[PDB]
């Protein structure tokens with residue numbers, strides 16, 4: 128019952144029923160003119176001040192949440208790429224907030240990087256607040272995908288011709304490398320944005336995942352999480368499960 132565990136539980140419980148959007152930021156494998164662009168082909172560390180700061184935040188979140196009782200054999204390249212993506216995902220969120228003139232302190236958000244059985248790396252984002260409404264979900268997805276595709280093409284470490292960069296940009300947008308949770312439907316039928324409950328989804332779902340400690344990653348595991356209150360960031364796996372238990 129450390130203050131950190133109690134503090135996270137209390138913070139989430141207060142936001143138990145806050146409606147938020149659910150996004151997934153991802154990438155897919157691409158081959159352009161014989162050039163392979165895989166999930167971890169975006170390893171440029173761009174020297175923009177905010178991005179550098181965000182990447183440092185991810186590194187330190189990883190460092191503080193690491194359990195040293197057990198050894199961790201995650202590949203260095205994998206960690207690097209995840210830290211970079213954490214900075215890029217956040218940069219996208221912050222750019223859209225700026226477009227809407229939303230004060231960052233008026234926003235609740237949660238970010239969690241995972242490795243899926245079939246898709247591999249992806250990043251969940253829950254985001255909402257008083258300045259957000261369900262009808263804005265589709266606009267948010269589109270804007271986030273614009274910024275996400277733009278930053279990915281900038282961060283790509285594969286030498287690309289201008290035509291190739293533009294093609295990659297178009298692929299990331301056309302194939303919706305940012306997804307928005309909607310109610311189940313038909314291809315022809317309309318899709319409705321499905322808002323989720325912030326604290327509940329975090330405590331009863333995201334905090335239940337198993338920590339990735341190996342390469343290749345365990346199917347369905349998580350790498351790293353963070354939130355707008357810096358509450359879950361530094362928690363070890365065992366502490367996260369304690370939060371879920373207390374939250375109930």
Ligand SMILES: [Mn+2]
Nearest residue numbers: 241243249251
């Ligand atoms: Mn997932």
